[PDB]
Every structure is written in C-alpha cells, then in structure tokens.
Design a protein around this ligand. Structure first.
Ligand code: 23E
Ligand code: 7HM
Length: 542
C-alpha cells in the first residue's frame, strides 16, 4: 500500500530554518507504495527476538504517573485542556484521559485522528553541496491519546528494547559507554570492517506487517489485561495507520506507515531496523557481526573477508534490506578505520587525559551545532540544542572552547546560572540547571572530559575551518574570553566556582589538578540513558 495518501489540502503552519513552505517537497519523497518480501532469515531473527521479549514483565502506568511524564509545553488537547492541566491532574484532563482509555478498551477498530505538521529545524546554508533540505513531517495523536500510550506502553518501550537487542540497543549508552562499545567491538575483530547503513525515508518504509510484527513482540511481555487490550487497539487504530488533519482542522489524507510522533516510534523503529539488519547480515554472510541500532540509525562492525569480498557482502546486505522494505539513501561503504565511520552524525576520535593516557570520545562536524547555537542566542526556542551539545559533546574541542565559553558569558550577563533550561536527550525532554553541568559531564564522560588535550590534526583543522566559514572568532579569542568567564565564576563560589574550575581548566596557563566532584554521585540519572523516545512526548526534571 501507499505510505501516504493526500487530499491536496496544505500542511499549514503551527543560517536557515525549515518551514511548512517546503512540506510539498517532503511529501513527494515520503509517498510511495511498498514491496516487502520476507524469508527464513527474517523469520528466524523474529523468533529469536520474541524469545528474548518473553523475559519482560511490563507494568501499566497509572493516570497520575502518565500525566507526570507529559512535557509542560506539550501540544494542547482539542478537548478543552492543555499540558498544564494534565500535569496538575485537573478534573477535565483526567476525566477525558479516562474516557479515551475506556474507548481503547471498547473500540478495537475505528482509526484515531492525527495532526500532521512541518517540523521547524535549523540547518546551515551550504550552497556548495546543493541547497536547502525540506522540513520533516511530524504526525501525532491528541494529548488524551498520548497519555493513554504512556499508561499502556511507557514501561514496554523503556524495558523491552534492551531485553530484546541486548548490547545492540544504542539508547542504553551514555556518550562514554557508546564510545567504549564501539572501541571494544572494533578491537575484538582480527581484521575489523565497519559500515553505517542509511535507510531512505525509514518511517515511510515501515509497512503495516512490520507494525503488526512489532506488536507480536510487545505481546510477549507479561502484561495487565487492559494494557494488552490497549496495545491491541492502539496497533489497529493508530500505529498501523490513520487519517491526517492539518493545524487548521482540514483533512490532508491518510497514513499506512510509521507515525513519527507516537510513543512507539523509537522502540518500533529500533526493533524493525534491528530485525531487518540482523536478517540481512545472515543473507550477506557477514562474519562475526556486532550491531549498534538507534531507531533507523545502524552501525555494523564485523570481520573483514577481504576488500572485494567486503564490497560484495555489503551489496548483498543492501539487496536483503531492500527486499525487507528498507532500501538505502546513500549506498553503504566499508570502512577499515573506526574514526571514519559516521553514526548518529558522530565519529570516534582520540585525545589524551592529564597523564598522557589515551581517551576515546565522540565528536562531529560542528557547523550545525554552531549554527543552531547562533539561532538560539538570537532568539528564544523551546529546546536548547546548545545545552544538549554541551552535555553530549562535553569532551570535544568546539563544545569546550566555544559553546561553554559563549553560553556561560550570556548566563553571567543575564544572571541566569540557576535558571533551569530544557534540552532533548534521546527524544526525551530534560529540565537542567547549567550549574549542574560539571556533575553531569563527570558522570557521562568521566573526570578526564575536563583535562583532554593532544587533539588530532584532523579534528583541530575541522574546527578551525568551521569557525572561519561561519565568521566565528578564532580559538585564541575564546581562550582569552574563557579566562574572564572562569574568573567571574570562581569569585561566586559554590556550584558557579565548580563550573569555573572544571569547565574552563583548559583555558588556564597552569592547569589545576581536578578531583572528583562529591555532588556528582548523588545526581539522579536513572532515567537518562535507558531508552529512545523520539516523538514520544516524554519529560523528566533532574
Ligand atoms: O585575531 C583574529 O584573527 C580575529 C579576531 C576576531 C574576529 C571576530 C571577532 N568577533 C567579535 O568580537 C564579535 N562576534 C563574536 O564574538 C562572535 C561570537 C560567537 C559567534 C557565533 C556562535 C558560536 C557558537 C555559539 C553561538 C554563537 C557565530 N558568530 C559569532 C561571533 C558569527 C556570527 O555572527 N554568526 C554565526 C552564525 C552561524 C554560526 C556561528 C555564528 C562580537 C562583536 C563583533 C563581532 C572578534 C575577534
Ligand atoms: O538526535 C537525536 O535525537 C538522537 C537520535 C539517536 C541517537 C542519538 O545519540 C546517539 C549518540 C550518543 C552519544 C553521542 Cl556523543 C553521539 C551520538 C541522538 N542524539 C545525539 C545528540 C546530540 C546532542 C544532543 C542530543 C542528542 C541525541 O539525542
């Protein structure tokens, strides 16, 4: 069937920001019929996955627990209440949620309505490698339905992926754990070869059968009867497909593929990508595979069979993925250096700690992080990508020297060091106080994140070239600015002094011997690197 059907009604509104004006261009790309052919490899992997899902015991969340996971600025319900009413457990909000839950238990077939919208994302004007990328489309059900999804499936999507995929489940890893996983996988092979596999419009390639197969995996959990019925009804009425309504309440058409804004998007995508890829690995006869899956993002590390054999095994892997309805965007290329693999937009790099000991860390091209941070300094945004980049890329040269320096100077000037800010980590929203950044960084990357040096010539040149292209002052200016930011922070004592001492130790003439932060141990990061929730409408306050 057609991934989408369009009435022609417009997807109306809610260096450059992506808008609803480019929606037509995205719609054309994501609209196609799917041809899927399953085989024995696919069926074998599925049974193996279900056998692992069978160990999971999932709990039904109470209305109250589901309400607390709702972001304060989550889209308002069309039934007369908003995210604040949900969080406060208001009568109107709660009564409506209960009527939605009751309807899921009673009605097993009627499709549930969804809103289609163009996402507003910031990208950098690259007139060299073509032009502007069209807006991604977000498809999501009403607030009432989203709270019900949490009651039925929050525990499932949070526990089942790890139980099924084990060490292959990418969302269980902090940045420090992810780099360690990739390094260990690479070092475990006699002659390693790795590749990233990019699926063209993954959500659109997800068939109705894939969504049912995905439910068959959920159904292996020990579940409460109402949770079991809610999952059965949500699959049939929402996950497999449904009608699309624009922001003006006009009918846009229909969807028979993955909705990007449902609780199960990340879990469903990860399970589907893993299933198809593990089966394709067997079809291609790739030897001693290690996979790392994050939604539609896949990395494979295996034993090289020779350069021509590897090129042949990758074409075979691609042919199998195509049969499973997961054709590629760019065709995959074998890599023989771990650093040359880009996965989840990141690459492994090496640096040294204070004692000259080798330290692996993940980095990326800083153009998009810098452009987005420039947009965020210019104007207010719901999520602060600068903060998530400081958190995730804390050991990088660019995040330490530019992002930490710039934003700490703004926070000092505005006296907003104590003001909690929202940021996204693996699709979940976190309200974070910037004064807590040293404790966060020590926990995710280790104490050495504050003492890294001997950055590679390639990394230094990529950062330096980027600054020049974007009209950002050179590294020497940042060192000078960080010294002043640091001095002001030190003079304040408490957490502010800790930010100064730890975050800006790279800036000083004579580096201080840094000791572990005592408050870092008592920091509750239990919900941080457990699962992915892209489009899942999840919130946590640290
Ligand atoms: O010795 C040498 O050879 C050169 C010396 C030199 C060169 C330029 C300066 N610039 C400045 O002082 C000013 N801008 C900045 O001091 C500045 C700071 C951050 C900037 C950022 C981002 C960096 C990441 C955090 C958010 C802010 C961007 N741009 C920045 C400029 C340049 C800019 O204007 N916009 C963009 C656009 C896209 C991406 C980045 C930028 C402030 C007043 C006058 C302009 C200072 C010294
Ligand atoms: O962007 C996403 O939603 C996303 C999706 C899949 C896998 C990811 O991380 C996988 C990874 C883990 C650690 C590192 Cl150092 C890089 C990549 C994602 N990341 C990347 C990111 C960078 C900065 C702020 C937040 C996020 C975030 O959530």
């Amino acid at each position: 069937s057609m991934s989408y059907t369009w009435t022609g009604a417009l997807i109306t509104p809610c260096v450059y920001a992506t808008t609803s004006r480019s929606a037509s261009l995205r719609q054309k790309k994501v609209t196609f019929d799917r041809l899927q052919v399953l085989d024995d490899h696919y069926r074998d992997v599925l049974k193996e996955m279900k056998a692992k899902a069978s160990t999971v015991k999932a709990k039904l969340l109470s209305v109250e627990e589901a309400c607390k996971l709702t972001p304060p600025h989550s889209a308002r319900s069309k039934f007369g209440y908003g995210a604040k009413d949900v969080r406060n457990l208001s009568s109107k909000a709660v009564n409506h949620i209960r009527s939605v839950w009751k309807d899921l238990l009673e009605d097993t077939e009627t499709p549930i309505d969804t809103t289609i919208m163009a996402k507003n994302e910031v990208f950098c004007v690259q007139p060299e490698k073509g032009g502007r990328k069209p807006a991604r489309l977000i498809v999501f059900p009403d607030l009432g339905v989203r709270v019900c999804e949490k009651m039925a499936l929050y525990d499932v999507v949070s526990t089942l992926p790890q139980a099924v995929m084990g060490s292959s489940y990418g969302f269980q890893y902090s940045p420090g754990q992810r780099v360690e996983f990739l390094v260990n996988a690479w070092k475990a092979k006699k002659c390693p070869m790795g590749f990233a596999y990019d699926t063209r419009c993954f959500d659109s390639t997800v068939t109705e059968n894939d969504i049912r197969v995905e439910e068959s995996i959920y159904q292996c959990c020990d579940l409460a009867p109402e949770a079991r019925q809610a999952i059965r009804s949500l699959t049939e009425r929402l996950y497999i497909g449904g009608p699309l309504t624009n922001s003006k309440g006009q009918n846009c058409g229909y969807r028979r593929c993955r909705a990007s804004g449902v609780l199960t998007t990340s879990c469903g995508n990860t399970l589907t990508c893993y299933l198809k890829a593990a089966a394709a690995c067997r079809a291609a006869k790739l030897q001693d595979c290690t996979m790392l899956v994050c939604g539609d993002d896949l990395v494979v590390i295996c034993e090289s069979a020779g350069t021509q054999e590897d090129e042949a095994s990758l074409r075979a892997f691609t042919e199998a993925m195509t049969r499973y309805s997961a054709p590629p965007g760019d065709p995959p290329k074998p890599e023989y250096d771990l650093e040359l693999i880009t996965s989840c937009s990141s690459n492994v790099s090496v640096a040294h700690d204070a004692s000259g000991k080798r330290v692996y860390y993940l980095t990326r091209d800083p153009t998009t992080p810098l452009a987005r941070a420039a947009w965020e300094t210019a104007r207010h945004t719901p999520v602060n990508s600068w903060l998530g980049n400081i958190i995730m890329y804390a050991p990088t040269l660019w995040a330490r020297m530019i992002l930490m320096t710039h934003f700490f100077s703004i926070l000092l000037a505005q006296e907003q060091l104590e003001k909690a800010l929202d940021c996204q980590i693996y699709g979940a929203c976190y309200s974070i106080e910037p004064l807590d950044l040293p404790q966060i960084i020590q926990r995710l990357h280790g104490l050495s994140a504050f003492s890294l040096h001997s950055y590679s010539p390639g990394e230094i040149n990529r950062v330096a070239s980027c600054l020049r292209k974007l009209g950002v002052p050179p590294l020497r200016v940042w060192r000078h600015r960080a010294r002043s930011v640091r001095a002001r922070l030190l003079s304040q004592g408490g957490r502010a002094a800790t930010c100064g001492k730890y975050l800006f130790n790279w800036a000083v003439r004579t580096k201080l011997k840094l000791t572990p932060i005592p408050a870092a141990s008592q920091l509750d990061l239990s919900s941080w690197f457990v699962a992915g929730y892209s489009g899942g409408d999840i919130y946590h306050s640290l």
